[PDB]
């Protein structure tokens, strides 16, 4: 009746877009870097180990100074670790006990947390008497919080379980812009180094490029086959790669609006939990559920090394702001620093 | 200098480690329970026995701390957030009496989940009194949903309430065998099932959970010594 011409028009739009992608696709990136000396093997060993968590760790985040890192666990605690001296700086007792993500503000004054409580709690560090308390309880989401990233001292984008991302406003509690369009639970999102664009990967096997100012999906990136668990931007800002539960990592390009290379292996069945990029972008680190991570060459799809320091499945990892080292957290309540 | 700041971090670390020990002492003495139910399963009646998406009831019985967690406030997609309950003591499942096939296809996915292979499930068949009048009146028998109920036989170990139609006892044990055959289909000794029965006026629900949770902790200790 009425849904016929709308679905048929939506179908034709997908074919002409697919034809436009193949029309602008002539040489694969794998063939371009074929005449380049590969890196080969890299010798990365564990440097620091953290032993101050009880329950499994979900997410973590580094800092702009590459000094501290915050992590969350089911015990209801937020520990701001010291990456050099292995000294705990803060221990925030959470009211809830099902936190699923955490974030570190670029200024180093605020931290984030969220989970099954459907409330994103911002904790201020530079308080008056040194007692860390909650600043604003961002309520309004109709689902569990999956990931969040700070933008400024009063702006933060959250990705809840109601297939909608919201640009909150601290000190006011009212949502400024809500990003809708996903049909699945958004799991993780990454921010470009311009605070203007961000991509969100949901459980519908598609990553949508959003705009912070206007507030709608600018571009839609497809190609995956299962739920997307993580996503990360390329350092230059014109590309990004993501992982899913199909044990494949695909690198997409914003300007080309299509994938460039796939990073996967035959004997890898476990899904990717977290992804990260190096400073130069040559190395691609992706976590897995088989209790160890991997390092991939982002230009030739060669596995440069396997990092197997953890005992349980890894759930979060990230390269420092200067790329000197990379941390990794797993479900064994243990955090490690790899370099 | 750097010695003063480093000493401040050492003092702050020991203060946190002291708080981590004090909180770990009160955390290992509590048992986390996931109260999960279907749509209109009547799990709020169990809460009476002692927006936001999680409800916590810290009811204590026999000087033992129990921490229940309600699901009300979340969505129907239980794929990504069910992984958060791989460390709880047990998952309390409530079934209200096709609302039965949906309960058996969810209990099946939880039992076969790769991260929930060591979490035990406690069952509580709610709406027993209404289930008795539904099969007695015959307006909607379980025969249309399950045609195998006619071929089922009542087990000899049935302990029904005196003065009840054995058809209700046959229906209760048929639902129990349906959930048990799913649990023992992939049961490798890491986690077992504890089916029970509950009505709208039963007051011994906290004692059933206490006896079920006692069996779980008592059985997992036997696996540490490889006695089982």
């Amino acid at each position, epitope marked *: 009746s009425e849904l016929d011409q709308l*679905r048929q028009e939506a179908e034709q739009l*997908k074919n002409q877009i697919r034809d436009a992608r193949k029309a602008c696709a002539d040489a694969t990136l794998s063939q371009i870097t074929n005449n380049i000396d590969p890196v080969g093997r890299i010798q990365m060993r564990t440097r620091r180990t953290l032993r101050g968590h009880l329950a499994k760790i979900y997410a973590m985040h580094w800092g702009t100074d590459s000094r501290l890192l915050v992590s969350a666990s089911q015990d209801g605690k937020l520990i701001i670790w010291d990456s050099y001296t292995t000294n705990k700086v803060h221990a925030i007792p959470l009211r809830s006990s099902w936190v699923m993500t955490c974030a570190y503000a670029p200024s180093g004054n605020y931290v984030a947390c969220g989970g099954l409580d459907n409330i994103c709690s911002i904790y201020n560090l530079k308080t008056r008497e040194g007692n860390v308390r909650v600043s604003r309880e961002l309520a309004g989401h109709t689902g569990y919080l999956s990931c969040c990233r700070f933008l400024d001292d009063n702006q933060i984008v959250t990705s809840s379980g109601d*297939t909608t991302c919201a640009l909150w406003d601290i000190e006011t509690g009212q949502q400024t812009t809500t990003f809708t369009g996903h*049909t*699945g639970d958004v799991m993780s999102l990454s921010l470009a180094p311009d605070t203007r664009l961000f991509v969100s990967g949901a*459980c*519908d*096997a*598609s990553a949508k490029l959003w705009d912070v100012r206007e507030g709608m999906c600018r571009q839609t990136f*497809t*190609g995956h*086959e*299962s*739920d997307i668990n993580a996503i990360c931007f390329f350092p230059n800002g014109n590309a990004f790669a993501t992982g899913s*539960d*199909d044990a494949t990592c695909r690198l997409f390009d914003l300007r080309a609006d299509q994938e460039l290379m796939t990073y996967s292996h035959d004997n890898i*069945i476990c*899904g990717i939990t977290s992804v990260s990029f190096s400073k130069s972008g040559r190395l691609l680190l992706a976590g897995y559920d088989d209790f160890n991570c991997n390092v991939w060459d982002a230009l030739k799809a060669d596995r440069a090394g396997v990092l197997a320091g953890h005992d349980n499945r890894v759930s979060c990892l990230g390269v420092t702001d200067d790329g000197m080292a990379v941390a990794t957290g797993s479900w064994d309540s243990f955090l490690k620093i790899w370099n | 200098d750097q010695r003063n700041e480093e000493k401040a971090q050492r003092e702050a670390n020991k203060k946190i480690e002291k708080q981590l020990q004090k909180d770990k002492q009160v955390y290992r003495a509590t048992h986390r329970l996931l109260l999960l139910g279907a*749509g209109e399963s009547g799990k709020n009646t169990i809460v009476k026995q002692m927006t936001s998406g999680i409800f916590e009831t810290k009811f204590q019985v026999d000087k033992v701390n129990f921490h229940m967690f309600d699901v009300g406030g979340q*969505r*129907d*997609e*239980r*794929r990504k957030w*069910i992984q958060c309950f791989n460390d709880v003591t047990a998952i309390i499942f409530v079934v209200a009496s*096709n609302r039965l*096939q*949906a309960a058996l*296809k969810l209990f*099946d*996915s*939880i039992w*076969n*989940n*790769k991260w929930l292979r060591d979490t035990s499930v406690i069952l509580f068949l709610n709406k027993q009194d209404l289930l008795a009048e539904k099969v007695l009146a015959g307006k909607s028998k379980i025969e*249309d*949903y*399950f*045609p*195998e109920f006619a071929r089922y036989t009542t087990p000899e170990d049935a302990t029904p309430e005196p003065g009840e139609d054995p058809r209700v006892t046959r229906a209760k044990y048929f639902i129990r065998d349906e959930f048990l055959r799913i649990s023992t289909a*992939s049961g490798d000794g890491r986690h077992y099932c504890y089916p029970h029965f509950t009505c709208s006026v039963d007051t011994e629900n906290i004692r059933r959970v206490f006896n079920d949770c006692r069996d779980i902790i008592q059985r997992m200790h036997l696996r540490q010594y490889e006695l089982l």
Partner: nanobody
Amino acid sequence: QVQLQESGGGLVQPGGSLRLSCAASGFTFSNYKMNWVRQAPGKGLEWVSDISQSGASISYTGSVKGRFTISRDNAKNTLYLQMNSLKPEDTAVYYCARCPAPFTRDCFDVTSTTYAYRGQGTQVTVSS
């Protein structure tokens, strides 16, 4: 881009036969467990059947157990659903659902009303 298109279905006489074909694309058919789900008019979604990776583990719901027949072809990426002796109570739209993670015994969110890994389905009506 995961795409699931269902074929067949329509007005069928009571006691007849019907067949539904589920064409799959955008993923490897030999790695994901497939399911079936129906939505009765004015009622919530109801699970129908499911098939394992190689078609070994087959399970049906009690309403249509033994009555229906399912089969999959990994080389063609096409799913089949056979119906025999249709009843006036089975009139509903049938969706071709696939639970997300590959090589997993669990199979979640098939019955949920907001699921991305399932097609628009085909309406099946049984009347005179």
